[PDB]
């Protein structure tokens, strides 16, 4: 029968940070999830600068002076200055621009590794401390130059907006790093979503490769 199905995306603390709902039969509705990469970092690792921000909290940081609201008191010009010296993170609109650049630049990017649902052969991949990405080959999806893929991982992850589309959303001081997550055929056959499955995501950068953990889970009720 049709139920109110809700697909929820949660931070590493397993608190829901994004959700979508629809009246559909169970295991028949497989929408594209579009959580923001920054929503996943809410209350997450210290690198992203959102470790004290609650889920569904508004994007922190002062507005860009180039925003659609125009100039205002205390507005930042960092959104127009070169971003080469900025850290890719979610703490400011210009830091979100730098994160968007890092996730879009061909050399740079982001990769995603499966968590508890990975086969036992991937035990060496590591736990949450490594974001399940202790070494290359554990990453099953994500946008990088080598286009990793898996015949068994339950989701695929990509950037949702192009650089030009995302830049203006960032200058408006809104969430502007939306991911596009699509269920694979394996995910469409899997039914353990009621318990949720977790992935690690790490930026591919000349450094420590900062990362976060996120989860996807299904909730449903009568309708």
């Amino acid at each position: 029968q049709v139920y109110n199905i809700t697909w929820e995306v949660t931070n590493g603390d397993r608190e829901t940070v994004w959700a979508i709902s629809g009246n559909h039969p169970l295991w028949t509705w497989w929408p594209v999830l579009t959580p923001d990469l920054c929503m996943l970092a809410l209350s997450g690792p210290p690198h992203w600068g959102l470790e004290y921000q609650a889920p569904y909290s508004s994007p922190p940081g002062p507005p860009c002076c180039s925003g659609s609201s125009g100039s205002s008191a205390g507005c930042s010009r960092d959104c127009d200055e070169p971003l080469t010296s900025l850290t890719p993170r979610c703490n400011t609109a210009w830091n979100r621009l730098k994160l968007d650049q890092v996730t879009h630049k061909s050399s740079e990017g982001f990769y995603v590794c499966p968590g508890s649902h990975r086969p036992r052969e991937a035990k060496s991949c590591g736990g949450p401390d490594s974001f399940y990405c202790a070494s290359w080959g554990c990453e099953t999806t994500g946008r990088v130059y080598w286009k990793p893929s898996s015949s068994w991982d339950y989701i695929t992850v990509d950037n949702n907006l192009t650089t030009s589309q995302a830049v203006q959303v960032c200058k408006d001081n809104k969430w502007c790093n939306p991911l596009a997550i699509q269920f694979t055929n394996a995910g469409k056959q899997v039914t353990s979503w009621t318990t949720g499955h977790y992935w690690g995501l790490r930026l591919y950068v000349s450094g420590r490769d900062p990362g976060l953990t996120f989860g996807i889970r299904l909730r449903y009720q009568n309708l």
């Binding site: 922190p60 940081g61 002062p62 100039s71 930042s76 010296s85 830091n95 050399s107």
Partner: protein, 537 residues
């Protein structure tokens, strides 16, 4: 006697550099990491100072690097050095007048400044000052009138002003450590709201290094000009009880004292108030106001106006003197050389330099003038370092080659062949460090990406730099005794040139364009007029 040398150094070095520079750097280029920007600029200066010790040792007559170059290395090199020195003095006068005018304007009040905002507007922020400093022009015209009249810097009043400056510096450091808090070096997005409704603020990352190590390096490049003044130790003139041993200790101690002062003052400034809320016009008094010690604005006002004076006068007094010296030698136009019979001073040169400084203060921002002076001074110091490096290997004055002659010369003292090979090696090495810095600054992202062309050029340039430095090392040094010698003459001058050129490469494109135009005017004067009327012709 060594104590006297270090005292001379600390006195000669400008004490007003931090009052005007600390805010501009700590807000625009570095944050609290300006504390480190001052350190690098110190070290870069030290390498220069030691070379000056040898350079002033090569000429018994004390003077400027112009005179030393003219006696030792020749007409063109001396012209370039003197022209860079002219820019340094003119633009230092302009910058210090800017600072003094801003301090007084803030003290008297903004409406006095807002008269300019009512009646004048350049309207070209990128290539022109967002606000013209008419009052700095008034100061410069007054001081040029005084200097033309024959008024000269007074030693006693200068000592008094340096003492008051140091006392106010100590008070600022104490107040920074009392009222300032380490939280201002750890600011985050939560603290990215400034009380004043000031727009287009550069928040940056926040914390201790909001603009990164590239910002720290740009600040160090901009802070290099503040440590200028140690020349007086190399050019002491009086006899020293242990010259090659007392001169370097004096130079290093003076530069360390200056770095301690600048470190303490910039630390106080960045600890009392957020770096992004610093007041470029007058950082220290506004920082005091933010902490509620508004009365201190007067004390700093007492000190700053004194310190800036000791700076402005110091830049202004020699500014006509180089022009006069060059004009007599025919390098510059003879009409500047003429001295009034009534004043017994080079009136025309003083008036012309004053007008140029007034125009530069009027039309250009404080940071723009600062960076132009920094680039000119860095070029002058790199030229001095290259001069010492070259002169160490020339024969004492009254082509084909073989690999055995190049790599293994058997002569115990420099031959003309050795001198020519060292000249060629110095030129090639200078071009090669220029290439290294270009790749390290323009190709910086390319190097981070590891692109084949950038890494290839970098590795080849660095290895060939080592090889050329080695070929210089292998040549015999001049047995001539000097009162001072740079210790590691094959390496230390080369590192000085490297650091200076890298710091120059940190400066903005506008600074490079202004400097290129200035050098173009200099070369036009030299090649069109200077060569033909030179007194040595």
């Amino acid at each position: 006697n060594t104590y006297d040398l270090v005292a001379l150094g600390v006195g000669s070095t400008l004490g007003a550099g931090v009052y005007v520079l600390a805010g501009a750097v700590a807000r625009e280029n570095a944050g609290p990491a300006i504390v480190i920007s001052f350190l690098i600029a110190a070290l870069a200066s030290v390498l220069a100072g030691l070379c000056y010790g040898e350079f002033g040792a090569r000429v018994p007559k004390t003077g400027s690097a112009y005179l030393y170059s003219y006696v030792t290395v020749g007409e063109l090199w001396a012209f370039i050095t003197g022209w860079n020195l002219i820019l340094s003095y003119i633009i230092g006068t302009s910058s210090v007048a800017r600072a003094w005018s801003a301090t007084f304007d803030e003290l008297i009040g903004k409406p006095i400044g807002e008269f300019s905002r009512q009646h004048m507007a350049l309207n070209a922020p990128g290539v022109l000052a967002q606000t013209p400093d008419i009052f700095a022009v008034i100061i410069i015209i007054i001081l040029t009138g005084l200097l033309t009249l024959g008024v000269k810097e007074s030693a006693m009043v200068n000592k008094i002003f340096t003492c008051i400056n140091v006392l106010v510096l100590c008070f600022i450091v104490v107040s920074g450590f009392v009222k300032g808090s380490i939280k201002n070096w750890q600011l985050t997005e939560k603290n990215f709201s400034c009380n004043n409704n000031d727009t287009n603020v550069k928040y940056g990352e926040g914390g201790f290094m909001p603009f990164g190590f590239s910002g720290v390096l740009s600040g160090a490049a901009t802070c290099f000009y503040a440590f200028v003044g140690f020349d007086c130790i190399a050019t002491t003139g009086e006899e020293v009880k242990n010259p090659q041993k007392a001169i370097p200790v004096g130079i290093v101690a003076s530069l360390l004292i200056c770095f301690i002062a600048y470190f303490g003052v910039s630390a106080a400034l960045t600890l009392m108030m957020p770096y992004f809320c610093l007041d470029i016009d007058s950082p220290l008094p506004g920082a005091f106001k933010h902490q509620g010690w508004e009365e201190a604005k007067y004390a700093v006002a007492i000190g700053s106006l004194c310190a800036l004076s000791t700076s402005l006068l110091g830049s202004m007094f020699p500014m006509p003197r180089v022009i006069y010296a060059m004009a007599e030698d025919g390098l510059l136009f003879k009409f500047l050389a003429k001295i009034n019979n009534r004043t017994k001073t080079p009136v025309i040169a003083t008036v012309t330099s004053g007008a140029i400084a007034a125009v530069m203060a009027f039309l250009f921002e404080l940071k723009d003038l600062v960076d132009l002076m920094s680039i000119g001074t860095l070029l002058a110091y790199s030229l001095v370092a290259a001069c010492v490096l070259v002169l160490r290997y020339q024969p004492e004055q009254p082509e084909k080659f073989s690999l055995k002659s190049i790599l293994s010369p058997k002569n115990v003292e420099p031959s003309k062949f050795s001198g020519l090979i060292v000249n060629i090696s110095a030129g090639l090495l200078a071009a090669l460090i220029i290439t290294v810095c270009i790749v390290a600054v323009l190709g910086r992202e390319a190097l981070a990406e590891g692109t084949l062309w950038a890494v290839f050029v970098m590795t080849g340039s660095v290895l060939l730099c080592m090889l050329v430095t080695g070929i210089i090392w292998r040549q015999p040094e001049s047995k001539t005794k000097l009162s001072f010698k740079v210790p590691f003459v094959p390496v230390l001058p080369v590192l000085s040139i490297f650091v200076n050129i890298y710091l120059m490469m940190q400066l903005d494109q506008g600074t490079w364009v202004r400097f290129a135009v200035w050098m173009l005017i200099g070369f036009t004067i030299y090649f069109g007029y200077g060569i033909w009327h030179s007194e040595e012709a």
